[PDB]
Amino acid sequence: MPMQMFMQVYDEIQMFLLEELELKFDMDPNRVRYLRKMMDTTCLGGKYNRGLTVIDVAESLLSDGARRKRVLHDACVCGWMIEFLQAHYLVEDDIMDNSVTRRGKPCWYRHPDVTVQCAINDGLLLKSWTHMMAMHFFADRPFLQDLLCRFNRVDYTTAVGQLYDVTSMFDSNKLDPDVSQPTTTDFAEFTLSNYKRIVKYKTAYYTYLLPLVMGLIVSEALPTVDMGVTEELAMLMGEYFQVQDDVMDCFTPPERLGKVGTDIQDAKCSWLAVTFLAKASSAQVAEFKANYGSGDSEKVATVRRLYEEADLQGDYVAYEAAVAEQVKELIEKLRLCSPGFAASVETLWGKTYKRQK
Amino acid sequence: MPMQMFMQVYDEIQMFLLEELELKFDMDPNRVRYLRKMMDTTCLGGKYNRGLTVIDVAESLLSDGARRKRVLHDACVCGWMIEFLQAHYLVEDDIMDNSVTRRGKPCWYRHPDVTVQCAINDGLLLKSWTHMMAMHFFADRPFLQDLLCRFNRVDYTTAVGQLYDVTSMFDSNKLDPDVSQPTTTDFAEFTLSNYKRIVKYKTAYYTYLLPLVMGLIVSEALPTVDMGVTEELAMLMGEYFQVQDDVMDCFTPPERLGKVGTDIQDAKCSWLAVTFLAKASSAQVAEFKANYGSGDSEKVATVRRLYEEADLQGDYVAYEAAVAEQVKELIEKLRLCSPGFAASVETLWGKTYKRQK
Ligand SMILES: CN(CCCCc1ccccc1)CCC(O)(P(=O)(O)O)P(=O)(O)O
Ligand SMILES: CN(CCCCc1ccccc1)CCC(O)(P(=O)(O)O)P(=O)(O)O
Numbered sequence: 001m002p003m004q005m006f007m008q009v010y011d012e013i014q015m016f017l018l019e020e021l022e023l024k025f026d027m028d029p030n031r032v033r034y035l036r037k038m039m040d041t042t043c044l045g046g047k048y049n050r051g052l053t054v055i056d057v058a059e060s061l062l063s064d065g066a067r068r069k070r071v072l073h074d075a076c077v078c079g080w081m082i083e084f085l086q087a088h089y090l091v092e093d094d095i096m097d098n099s100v101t102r103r104g105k106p107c108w109y110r111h112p113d114v115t116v117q118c119a120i121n122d123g124l125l126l127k128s129w130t131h132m133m134a135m136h137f138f139a140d141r142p143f144l145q146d147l148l149c150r151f152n153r154v155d156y157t158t159a160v161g162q163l164y165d166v167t168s169m170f171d172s173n174k175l176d177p178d179v180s181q182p183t184t185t186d187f188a189e190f191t192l193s194n195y196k197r198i199v200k201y202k203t204a205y206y207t208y209l210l211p212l213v214m215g216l217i218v219s220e221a222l223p224t225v226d227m228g229v230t231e232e233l234a235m236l237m238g239e240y241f242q243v244q245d246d247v248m249d250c251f252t253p254p255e256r257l258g259k260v261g262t263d264i265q266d267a268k269c270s271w272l273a274v275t276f277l278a279k280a281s282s283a284q285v286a287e288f289k290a291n292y293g294s295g296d297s298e299k300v301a302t303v304r305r306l307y308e309e310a311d312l313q314g315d316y317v318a319y320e321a322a323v324a325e326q327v328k329e330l331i332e333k334l335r336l337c338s339p340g341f342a343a344s345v346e347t348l349w350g351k352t353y354k355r356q357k
Numbered sequence: 358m359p360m361q362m363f364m365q366v367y368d369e370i371q372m373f374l375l376e377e378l379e380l381k382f383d384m385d386p387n388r389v390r391y392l393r394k395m396m397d398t399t400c401l402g403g404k405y406n407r408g409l410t411v412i413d414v415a416e417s418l419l420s421d422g423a424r425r426k427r428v429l430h431d432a433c434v435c436g437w438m439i440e441f442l443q444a445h446y447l448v449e450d451d452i453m454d455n456s457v458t459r460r461g462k463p464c465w466y467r468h469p470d471v472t473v474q475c476a477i478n479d480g481l482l483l484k485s486w487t488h489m490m491a492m493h494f495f496a497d498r499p500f501l502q503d504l505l506c507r508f509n510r511v512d513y514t515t516a517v518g519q520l521y522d523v524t525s526m527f528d529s530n531k532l533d534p535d536v537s538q539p540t541t542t543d544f545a546e547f548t549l550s551n552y553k554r555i556v557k558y559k560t561a562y563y564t565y566l567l568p569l570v571m572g573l574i575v576s577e578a579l580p581t582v583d584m585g586v587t588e589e590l591a592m593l594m595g596e597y598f599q600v601q602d603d604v605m606d607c608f609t610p611p612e613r614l615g616k617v618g619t620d621i622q623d624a625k626c627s628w629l630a631v632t633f634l635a636k637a638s639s640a641q642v643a644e645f646k647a648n649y650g651s652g653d654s655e656k657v658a659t660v661r662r663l664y665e666e667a668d669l670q671g672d673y674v675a676y677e678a679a680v681a682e683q684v685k686e687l688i689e690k691l692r693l694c695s696p697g698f699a700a701s702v703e704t705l706w707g708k709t710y711k712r713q714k
């Protein structure tokens with residue numbers, strides 16, 4: 001049912017946007033249908049976990065069935081703002097990471113009749129829609145300002161996190177626009193501390209904290225919860241969530257994930273990379289620096305192998321257990337003064353813990 | 358004094374941005390350096406015509422000591438929001454139009470140590486900053502919602518224009534995300550009405566209509582002018598402005614313009630291109646199609662050669678005169694009830710009419 005009306009509001013939004021493009025932007029049918037396909041390919045195709053969470057939080061907190069419908073509808077729009085925001089990130093992300101597949105299908109910039117230059121712009125259009133839809137529905141809403149302040153900061157912090165992610169192969173001390181530099185060879189920068197910063201900003205905020213806050217805002221209950229504990233949980237579940245993505249990027253079959261990993265080729269500072277270098281032996285670390293950050297398959301195979309050889313799946317489990325009980329503890333601290341919020345928060349966790357996706 | 362006070366609020370804005378990233382975003386001194394240089398290289402180097410216009414419009418309309426400098430500061434912030442927005446477009450546009458030089462210096466993505474994927478993200482960062490500085494300085498001003506609504510609007514419509522720009526060289530009938538097609542061979546879609554559409558949306562709104570609008574907003578004078586006549590002026594000055602951009606791309610010397618043209622290699626629907634086709638003879642129209650859209654040295658020269666012989670200046674000066682006359686009378690309509698405003702519009706026109714760069 002949540003998923004039912006979630007798709008109903010999607011159609012509203014798609015109608016409003018595309019129609020306006022024809023009525024107020026002098027757009028021709030061919031281009032109007034192109035945006036439809038671009039929208040559907042990039043926004044539909046996922047499990048909508050960020051969007052659906054907003055509804056759950058809103059519903060779980062609204063405790064005259066109009067107030068219920070008001071909060072419900074708004075929660076769905078706020079739901080699609082993040083889904084569209086995620087749609088925006090992934091389009092640009094796939095481009096930057098030179099990815100091939102996304103959600104079982106080719107990445108947007110990989111579509112035969114979608115140019116890279118146009119893909120970039122579509123990615124921007126996606127971001128502009130979040131604002132366009134919000135302004136259309138929340139027009140006369142007391143929280144409109146607060147909603148967008150927090151929405152944009154999260155977007156901003158996520159872009160910053162992508163700065164950290166995109167520039168982790170480079171010795172930050174040799175980071176100067178006017179002078180080039182190649183992939184690091186010592187990987188001194190590949191530290192858990194540098195990994196944690198990357199993940200906290202590029203993933204955590206928009207994937208866990210944002211969905212929670214928007215649901216709290218439409219529910220007019222933000223001041224009721226302990227924003228501090230809530231923040232601690234969002235960062236914790238966020239990191240964990242990203243650590244999973246990193247392992248799945250290397251071990252989960254492309255068809256089960258719906259995308260072909262590029263971390264090894266892109267010499268990304270993944271969790272698997274910083275955890276390996278931290279425990280591996282002289283020879284292991286050497287064979288790594290010699291085969292990492294390359295497209296060659298025997299070079300790629302080597303890095304995959306070396307990961308297994310080093311048994312990272314065991315470090316993972318210990319990490320997962322650490323988080324699992326750290327999350328449980330925080331939720332109990334939250335459950336004390338806000339049981340309604342506590343429940344919705346645990347559902348988000350349960351959707352994360354040991355996911356295969 | 359305007360430029361000076363404008364350039365000081367700049368630092369006041371840069372300080373805030375970078376110092377925030379140092380503590381609240383956990384950024385290392387190196388990346389804070391990289392962003393400072395990026396911010397200075399992408400937001401500085403131009404002539405600041407959009408920002409400066411906002412200040413002029415604003416102080417021209419305040420008709421209480423500090424009340425004045427208050428409005429003066431607000432106008433400078435808005436001035437930089439557009440400059441930053443323009444900086445955002447220009448980085449993403451040089452990447453899209455695969456340009457080489459910008460404002461004298463090499464395009465941002467062309468910089469020695471600026472990777473394309475990072476460049477893309479830096480541009481997104483530049484956009485994020487327009488919202489960041491806005492909320493910081495205007496979190497108390499009542500006009501904030503409108504100010505940001507009108508801002509995102511123009512921003513949206515501009516991305517929509519960029520959509521017409523990048524898809525103009527392709528027969529929109531075969532436009533379909535799954536099947537690729539070459540650059541239109543017949544160039545049938547290169548019509549003046551289609552040119553007018555792309556121009557009105559990718560230039561007019563944010564280059565002319567926005568500065569006037571923000572200036573009216575920060576001065577609380579928005580409702581004292583005939584928006585209908587104001588928009589007619591913006592759309593008219595914007596088209597003309599963009600038409601000059603196209604001519605300068607083919608005929609103005611790089612060292613003076615500050616950039617190397619790419620409209621001919623990118624097979625862009627330029628004013629020169631549509632005006633040519635609309636008058637050229639069979640031979641000319643034929644040879645045109647055989648050399649346009651290529652990156653080859655001599656072919657590109659052949660296109661200029663056909664542009665000159667087609668005597669496209671005679672139509673330009675005629676067009677300019679047609680516009681000059683149409684703008685004049687519109688400005689008079691404005692003067693009737695908005696003298697002060699009309700005056701600021703004269704200056705803006707004065708900076709557009711026969712500009713060189
Ligand atoms: C959290 N991440 C990026 C969020 C993208 C954030 C962003 C911000 C600004 C501009 C572009 C993208 C999402 C996970 C990944 O995308 P995926 O595995 O889906 O490719 P990656 O592992 O490559 O990070
Ligand atoms: C006003 N125009 C930007 C249009 C860019 C619009 C845009 C860019 C990126 C994202 C959204 C919209 C500016 C003129 C050009 O930039 P330039 O000659 O400076 O390259 P172009 O002739 O390429 O348009």
Ligand SMILES: [Mg+2]
Pocket residue numbers: 093096097165
């Ligand atoms: Mg990435």
Ligand SMILES: [Mg+2]
Pocket residue numbers: 093094097099262
């Ligand atoms: Mg990726």
Ligand SMILES: [Mg+2]
Pocket residue numbers: 245246249263
């Ligand atoms: Mg990944």
Ligand SMILES: [Mg+2]
Pocket residue numbers: 450454522
């Ligand atoms: Mg362009």
Ligand SMILES: [Mg+2]
Pocket residue numbers: 450451454456619
């Ligand atoms: Mg360009």
Ligand SMILES: [Mg+2]
Pocket residue numbers: 602603606618619620
């Ligand atoms: Mg140009």
